[PDB]
Design a protein around this ligand. Structure first.
Ligand SMILES: NC(=O)c1ccc[n+]([C@@H]2O[C@H](COP(=O)([O-])OP(=O)(O)OC[C@H]3O[C@@H](n4cnc5c(N)ncnc54)[C@H](O)[C@@H]3O)[C@@H](O)[C@H]2O)c1
Ligand SMILES: NC(=O)c1ccc[n+]([C@@H]2O[C@H](COP(=O)([O-])OP(=O)(O)OC[C@H]3O[C@@H](n4cnc5c(N)ncnc54)[C@H](O)[C@@H]3O)[C@@H](O)[C@H]2O)c1
Ligand SMILES: NC(=O)c1ccc[n+]([C@@H]2O[C@H](COP(=O)([O-])OP(=O)(O)OC[C@H]3O[C@@H](n4cnc5c(N)ncnc54)[C@H](O)[C@@H]3O)[C@@H](O)[C@H]2O)c1
Ligand SMILES: NC(=O)c1ccc[n+]([C@@H]2O[C@H](COP(=O)([O-])OP(=O)(O)OC[C@H]3O[C@@H](n4cnc5c(N)ncnc54)[C@H](O)[C@@H]3O)[C@@H](O)[C@H]2O)c1
Ligand SMILES: Oc1cc(Cl)ccc1Oc1ccc(Cl)cc1Cl
Ligand SMILES: Oc1cc(Cl)ccc1Oc1ccc(Cl)cc1Cl
Ligand SMILES: Oc1cc(Cl)ccc1Oc1ccc(Cl)cc1Cl
Ligand SMILES: Oc1cc(Cl)ccc1Oc1ccc(Cl)cc1Cl
Lengths: 297, 297, 297, 297
């Protein structure tokens, strides 16, 4: 009697290249709520994505609670680091991948969606990129840092800015952030922490700008590490999954649907009084003041 | 395809005395999602509440989206400032109101629910009280301040503590707070600001205690002022409704269902990864750094 | 050329019973900056304190950088849980300790200082007490919780409220809090976490009330665990000292003067633009997002 | 008896081009505490600065409490948007201003200080720049936004990274931020809000990196609007000065020394337990929950 009803709504999801990330999960959730799904796929990944999708490689991942399979109405190539055609270096233009497709700058993708569907109700940003992520900040170059900011923070400003004209009032956008913006997380380097802090601050500022301008709500979800525990935690994400499992207020893993479900709620009319917010979907880790697994205890 | 499904779940809502507050709205929301509703009504208010309910006075307020009317399975008298019978002063015991009913201490109400239904899945705290609320802190007495804390913060600890034994794991609780705990709001006096700060801190602590103990999630909603604008804003709440309307990132009022809908989501399985959180359902006011209506602008 | 100059200023320090806590350290700091020191000693502790002080037991602890020894102008008995004489139970009045001294309620101590010195410039609150501190919140009684709040949070409101009339404008107060108010710290039980959250919220509210009323600044210091490492960390504080040492942005212990020095700065005219603030003097622990000593790393 | 003693310490202050900003005030404060002052002046401003300094134009501004005048040991040209010579476009290299001086990239200035003095104890960052600051975020270009980030956030990472090798352990750095990073402040556009959020997040991360690496403390001061009230507030800063005056917990203006004094304390040994912190020196504005001057009240 209380459904998250997105029927008749259209969502553009930026950042889906496979079925293993949060982007896929949000899409599944919105599709379960009834939304029409449009996807923005990073150019270099476009081919394998469309092909696997075609060969039925993601079919098990497309199954909705309903039992039916999720439908992706259209996949759009996109490279969110470029706003307009004149911004692309021939160096890039000339790469085979970018060579093989077109209309992938933000301005172009937005015009194609306008031409193809005329309007959208929901904008989901689920992308990030940072070439020097494995370096400490003291060792990150200016180019590396600006690259992280450009792909992970400004890309949101650009997408929203370019899609705003076709977003129906009462619509919403959501992005994904991570706690490294507010607390020290060694290993999340290369200015990615910096980028998440900018994205969260922009979320607030854009809630005011877009809110007053078109009645669009803007929020971000600070998500925990995604996945189940590794047989042998090695690598940044594996160790974080284990750490969160041992140390959160509630001991359990985090599954992608958990984030997808929160996002679906946040972009629905049920969330009408929520905007400019940072919602933690991380098993309550962020609230803990000490690690329960420290050997001192 | 994405419903907030609470069918087969039972909720005990503490703090409903009429249909004009947030308590009523949360109940409506949970009832729309399919939950069985039990209500805790403050002793002195019990009579007029049950009577108006009986005369059909709240019928228009009971209408669910469904078109059907909300059913309150049972109303329990309750006074959350008293944990057990031996805690009550004969002075109180002897008052006609308290005289007219029984089993109203927290320990007693919990045993009655156990006897009557055996278990519950959701605990909603929607109550507060503060005798010196109109006084600045510099003028609030020790008794007044402790009274606000006892009824508005400790009452949550007591309810959760007494109901925990009958809460099915995977269950959840939710309370309502207000921004005066974190920022200065002149006029919210008598230690009520103090009480909301304690309630929010306890929410975090209890998410860990109850989370690890019984897999129960615990969150609080920081709500905005409830109601539409007054013809002539006079009084603390009227002026705050107008201030929020003029100054929030999105200009609109806040209706009770807006909070009820967020609560319904938060206590559902869809919110499984969210606990120890303070969720703002206030049109994004809290994020603003300046009042847009200040005459300097 | 830039001295923290408190010469000609008078400070009343509530909460000194020995030379091992933060209260003693703040007094030392203020005394080094030139302030006249008045002390509020908890009644039951009064005797051993004055006696040890007299026998020269604290002499090594009184040595100022200057080489000279700190002078305590006057020790006042005090019990900050009682505002006025009529508030004391004969049960308490009759105890030998309370029996042996007088003028120890907040209202009385304030009148004595007025009679003795006429005015003060600085108010330091360095006290706390919580009978059920070793119990989890789920096991804390209403009386235990209210007792923690009454002695650890409301006592500040009372002292400030009673001393405000004799505080010279441009004066300041400072209290000590702890991170358990904002983050989950297992082991800081009995409502002490709740009390620290109320104290921090009251700090903000009182900065506005006292600021506008008498140009008095009000801030609180969120301090880390005090002391060097135990040979064998056992007990809440020992383990926390070790945890902070291993996990803070800068690896070192925290000494009492470190907090005393920050307090001296905060109550001086140099801090004229700082009020309603929570200053962390904890080696930057609070900023960390993960424990570096978790075995997963 | 409690002096902020910086005698024998050397400070490099990046961002002084005149005597009207916070940079000048921090320098004055450090000079009053006894530090040897080195200044980093933005290339295009270098000439008028050195000349006015020479003609005694800033003499009244150089007067220390002491009565003596502040001495600037050496002015270094600097452009913090360029890390190394190969990073500069001939387009810039060729401009007369950049043409007239040398050794102004971050790497070069750091080597000159090393050659000239060998080491420093304190690093002060007091600079920012944002070409599109007057535009809302929805209208800011990718280049404009990245430019703000590059000059206002990454410049700090670069300076610290390049000076770290010559900073004596136990040293400290301080930067200046503004609340627009955490709350919505209409008018602080062009990604400057984004840049301040990144700078604050980097402050935390660098407190860990530099703290563990060389025992260097890193903090930032969130300052209020600088200056007294305008006869007619027009322009972003004038209106903000008036707004803060009317709305802060304590009604008064903010003078540059107020910030300079806090900075001097923060970079001194007295602040040894403080790192990764955001200290508000803004008359407590940030704590307010509503504007007292809103017409609704
Ligand atoms: N994975 C986690 O544990 C976790 C935790 C917190 C936040 N997040 C955030 O969630 C979002 C999704 O990350 P994920 O973990 O699902 O990984 P993912 O690789 O599935 O998602 C990142 C996506 O960004 C896309 N992308 C990269 N550069 C792009 C560009 N220039 N243009 C267009 N698309 C580009 C990739 O193709 C990819 O689909 C990110 O914002 C990430 O920071 C992830
Ligand atoms: N109304 C608002 O604008 C607003 C904004 C933020 C938060 N809130 C919070 O929402 C909750 C609900 O408030 P509301 O505005 O709906 O008002 P309300 O009067 O409808 O709710 C308060 C309830 O507390 C009950 N109550 C008081 N003392 C009690 C006691 N000793 N034992 C048992 N019940 C007792 C009353 O009977 C009443 O039903 C409170 O926690 C309040 O602080 C309200
Ligand atoms: N010790 C730490 O590691 C630490 C860390 C953070 C905060 N703090 C805070 O610092 C303050 C000082 O604590 P401390 O550790 O120095 O211990 P302490 O025992 O030296 O200080 C507490 C003081 O409170 C006094 N006191 C207790 N009940 C009182 C009453 N009813 N009336 C008057 N005085 C009373 C005691 O006599 C004692 O002097 C407290 O507020 C505490 O919460 C301490
Ligand atoms: N002025 C205020 O009210 C206020 C309030 C909060 C924070 N702040 C912050 O205080 C710091 C100082 O600002 P201010 O108001 O004193 O103004 P200011 O103009 O005195 O300081 C900014 C300085 O940055 C320098 N600068 C700009 N681009 C540079 C570059 N590429 N390389 C080297 N130097 C460059 C300028 O030459 C100038 O000296 C900034 O970080 C600002 O954001 C100012
Ligand atoms: O933000 C994240 C946080 C976590 Cl715990 C795990 C993955 C994350 O996502 C990214 C991190 C860095 C880069 Cl370069 C790209 C992405 Cl998608
Ligand atoms: O918390 C509240 C906040 C707002 Cl804006 C309006 C009403 C609120 O609710 C209360 C406030 C004080 C007392 Cl004594 C009782 C209640 Cl129910
Ligand atoms: O607040 C504190 C925090 C820490 Cl880590 C250590 C001691 C503290 O101080 C107290 C804690 C509880 C009680 Cl009952 C009394 C006091 Cl003085
Ligand atoms: O940060 C600031 C905040 C305020 Cl209230 C006033 C001035 C500030 O400083 C700047 C703001 C924008 C740019 Cl482009 C450069 C500088 Cl120095």
């Amino acid at each position: 009697g209380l459904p998250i009803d997105l029927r008749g709504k259209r969502a553009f999801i930026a950042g889906i290249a496979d079925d293993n990330g949060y982007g896929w999960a949000v899409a599944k959730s919105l599709a379960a709520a009834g939304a029409e799904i449009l996807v923005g796929t990073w150019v270099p990944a476009l081919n394998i994505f469309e092909t696997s999708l075609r060969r039925g490689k993601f079919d098990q991942s497309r199954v909705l609670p309903d039992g039916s399979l999720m439908e992706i109405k259209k996949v759009y190539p996109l490279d969110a680091v470029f706003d307009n055609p004149e911004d692309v270096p021939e160096d890039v233009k000339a790469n085979k991948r970018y060579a093989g497709s077109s209309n992938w700058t933000v301005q172009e993708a937005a015009e194609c969606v306008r031409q193809d569907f005329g309007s959208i109700d929901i904008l989901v940003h689920s992308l990030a990129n940072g070439p020097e992520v494995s370096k400490p900040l003291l060792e990150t170059s200016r180019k590396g840092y600006l690259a992280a900011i450009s792909a992970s923070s400004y890309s949101f400003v650009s997408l929203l800015s370019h899609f705003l004209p076709i977003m129906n009032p009462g619509g919403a956008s959501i992005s994904l952030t991570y706690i490294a913006s507010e607390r020290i997380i060694p290993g999340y380097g290369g200015g990615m922490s910096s980028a998440k802090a900018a994205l969260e601050s922009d979320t607030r500022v854009l809630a005011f700008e877009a809110g007053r301008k078109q009645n669009i709500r803007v929020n971000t979800i600070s998500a925990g590490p995604l996945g189940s525990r590794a047989a042998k935690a090695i690598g940044f994400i594996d160790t974080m999954i284990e750490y969160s499992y041992n140390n959160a207020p509630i001991q359990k893993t985090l599954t992608a649907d958990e984030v997808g479900n929160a996002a679906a709620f946040l972009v629905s009319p049920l969330a009408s009084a929520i905007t400019g917010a940072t919602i933690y979907v991380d098993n309550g880790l962020n609230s803990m003041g000490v690690a329960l697994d420290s050997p001192v205890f």
